[PDB]
């Protein structure tokens, strides 16, 4: 029973982070832990992703208490550098979020991802 329990396996990892890159190219993503919690307690968040190998794990483990209280799915991913390459940014981002927007052309893939990870959790 570790502290990063809903850790996604390989194929679900690849589909959630190509949805990440589509969102980053569609200007619908928030990069980083404190902007993630700011958009989370603002409310606009379809789902949030953390990285399960940051060198202190608690600096993004503070996000569960917000997200499963405000009823939004959350998923750990086994590589911060892969999530950085997904977000399309130089330094490794460890906590990304997808904002909510019904004027974005990845709504179908976002909802498929969200249904898969609610079944995962």
């Amino acid at each position: 029973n570790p502290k990063a329990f809903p850790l996604a396996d390989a194929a679900l990892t690849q589909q959630i982070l190509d949805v990440v890159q589509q969102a980053a190219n569609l200007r619908q993503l928030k990069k980083g832990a404190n902007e993630a919690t700011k958009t989370l307690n603002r409310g606009i968040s379809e789902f949030i992703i953390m990285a399960a190998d940051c060198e202190p794990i608690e600096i993004l483990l503070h996000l569960p208490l917000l997200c499963e209280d405000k009823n939004v799915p959350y998923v750990f991913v086994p590589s911060r550098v892969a999530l950085g390459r997904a977000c399309g940014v130089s330094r490794p981002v460890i906590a990304a979020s997808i904002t909510t927007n019904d004027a974005s052309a990845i709504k179908t893939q976002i909802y498929a991802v969200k249904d898969k990870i609610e079944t995962l959790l």
Partner: protein
Amino acid sequence: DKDIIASRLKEDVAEQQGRVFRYFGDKLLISEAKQSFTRVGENNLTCISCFQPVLNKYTFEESSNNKGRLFAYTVSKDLQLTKYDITDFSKRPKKLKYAKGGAKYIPTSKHEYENTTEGHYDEILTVAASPDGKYVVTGGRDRKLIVWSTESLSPVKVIPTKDRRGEVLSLAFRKNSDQLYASCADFKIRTYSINQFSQLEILYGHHDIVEDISALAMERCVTVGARDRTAMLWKIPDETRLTFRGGDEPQKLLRRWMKEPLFFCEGSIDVVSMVDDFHFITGSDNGNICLWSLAKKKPIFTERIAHGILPEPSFNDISGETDEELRKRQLQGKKLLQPFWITSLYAIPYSNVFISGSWSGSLKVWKISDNLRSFELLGELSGAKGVVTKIQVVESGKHGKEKFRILASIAKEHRLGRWIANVSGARNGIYSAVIDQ
């Protein structure tokens, strides 16, 4: 007799026919080279491209220009490129001509239809050298192409990419010619001609950011985009495309193995080289390295995790706790082990062996087999600690005995982003290995 007809066919008719002919699979002894690091005073060296004068091109009139010396060109993220003398295999490379740009080359109009300033203004990413030996192209983060003359490194012509994110990532000449193909990050592919200093064609059609690219003497060009698990062979004169996708699923591979083993899906295709005009190789993100034919959408041979798996974060810097059982259980077992990436891959053109590289330090030189459908680990060169951003091979000798020179550019940052993950003892340099026979 047979020796004369063999040498006379292997001189030209194989190299224009297309199949692999320069077989030195077991002729090349594997691991007894003179491995030489060379320090270099830049930050985060980005790309290498060596130019060798071809001996007696296709009829005669040997090569272009000194008369018969090899060369190399390197380029860093400090906005400078350095010409290298490389030709003396007995000793180290020699810095010959520096050429550096800086913040004074910022265009003041910023209107993007002209970047006629000659230097650079950030993070040059790729140099290629012309086969005619009188031009060297370069391109990087400042949406530009620059041609320099070959021995004074003075800028001759400035070719803007003419798009707001018209962001070049890798250049590639096609051999013994003057058309080059430039990858970009606005998903297109540029085709330039050097001798006219011109842009022939903008071939679109790639879906995501097209990251790397190679070409051979036949006028076809292979490209690889990052995050859609694909590889496009552009046949230019028929203006058509061939779309090779990956698609190894871990559930089917686990079902194939469990009858008798930790692997995972493909993240990204990264680097390429064409072995011939009918096969090629892709070194992907997740450790897969794949030999593809031109006949099948599936790859022929997808070798698994290339350079091993990264060592996990230790039991004192994972969770900030005190007790060792808690800071070891937060590693979650092997479930967050991540593979070494294939950072750069390079095949000797029309041959058997190709060279990979990662930040696992070790250039693993494989060898393909004679039935052209499998490859095995020939050798491993443990000489270059650092990321291996591109690998070049320059050779010398006769028809019989060949003395090859593996050059590789070694840095402490990947050539696109920073992304330093567990790098230890890795200095900006050029890794030389004079392999023989």
